[PDB]
Amino acid sequence: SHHWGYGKHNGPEHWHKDFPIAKGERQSPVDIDTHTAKYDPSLKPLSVSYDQATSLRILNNGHAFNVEFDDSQDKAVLKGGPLDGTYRLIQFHFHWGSLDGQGSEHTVDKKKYAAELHLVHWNTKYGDFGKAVQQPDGLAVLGIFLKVGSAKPGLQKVVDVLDSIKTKGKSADFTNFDPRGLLPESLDYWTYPGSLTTPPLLECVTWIVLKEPISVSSEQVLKFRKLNFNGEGEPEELMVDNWRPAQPLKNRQIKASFK
Ligand SMILES: Nc1nc(Cl)nc2c1ncn2[C@@H]1O[C@H](COS(N)(=O)=O)[C@@H](O)[C@H]1O
Ligand code: NA
Ligand SMILES: [Zn+2]
């Protein structure tokens, strides 16, 4: 069993030893250089259809927390933009910092945001998530940057349950949460082919990164930083800086949906 994390001893610079694809040709995240990304007038409109989303549970996995959805049918899907076909929402999670100046995985002209939200979807033509991650077009991850300013009301239900899942392996019922409340106003985006940003680092993701960040309050993000990487009763290691830094772009082009 693997023992990866974000510390000096088991962090991103170590991952390549168990997961050699870490040094691959389409690794994520990347820096988005806004003056090199090209507007692509042929990107179709992005369609976020979350009306029938069914959230189930929230889990501290020792790396982040995941809000899990019922993906047994087409209840919450992402279509359009660069995507062919239908991608089903399976979960969302975040990456964040110890301080507001770092936390995001993607960067924008080298700017790091305080946090990044990842809504993870799988291509329904592959039948299940485990089959989808074996395909170059198996996943679509919608990435949303968080900056610290005004509170995000649609996030507070998440923040308030975190006290009940402080430590690794803890979960809580998390029904009737509406992920539409985490979106910015604009769906303008950048897109590029990449990977999972955690082990196993599989090169199966179409990344769609929204240009407009959402604002969250310092109180909201401070509560993210009170979670623990450790399990119950173990010495406290605060769950902070659970982000992978930018990876080489290699032979890839980042496309913009907007001028
Ligand atoms: N052992 C594993 N096998 C497979 Cl098959 N998938 C896995 C995985 N461990 C994590 N995942 C997924 O990868 C996302 C992280 O990557 S991210 N930041 O969204 O790019 C996580 O939340 C999960 O969905
Ligand atoms: Na916003
Ligand atoms: Zn992620």
Q: How many CA atoms lie within 13 A of 35 on its CB side?
A: 2
Nearest C-alpha neighbor of 30 from the set 108, 137, 117: 108
CB 93 less than 6 A from any atom of ligand 1? yes
Residue nearest to atom 14 of ligand 1 (CA): 196
Q: Say if residues 259 and 40 touch (Cβ distance below 8 Å).
A: no
Method used experimentally = X-ray
Resolution in A: 1.5
Can you give the residue ranges of every domain in the chain?
A: 1-259
Cα dihedral angle (186, 188, 190, 196), rounded to 10 degrees? 40
Radius of gyration of the chain (CA): 17
For residue 161, report the phi and psi dihedrals to the nearest 5 degrees.
-90, -10
**What is the DSSP pairing of strand 77-80 with strand 46-49?**
antiparallel
Residue 160 makes CB contacts below 8 A (sequence gap 6+) with: none
- For 1-259, CATH gives 3.10.200.10
Q: Give the tokens for residue 255.
A: 């496309």
* Contacts for 56 with CB less than 8 Å, ≥ 6 apart: 68, 69, 70, 173, 174, 175
Q: Strands, DSSP E only, in the chain?
A: 31-32, 38-39, 46-49, 55-60, 65-69, 77-80, 87-96, 107-108, 115-123, 139-148, 171-173, 189-194, 205-210, 214-216, 255-256
Atom of ligand 1 at shortest distance to CA of 93?
22
**CA of 145 relative to ligand 2 center, distance in Å:** 9
Q: d(Cα 212, Cα 146) in Å, to the nearest integer? A: 9
Nearest by Cα to 217 from 142, 158, 141, 143: 158
Per-residue DSSP letter, 186: -
Tell me if 197 CB under 6 Å of ligand 1: yes
HEC per residue, 154-183: HHHHHHHHHHHHCCCCCEEECCCCCHHHHC
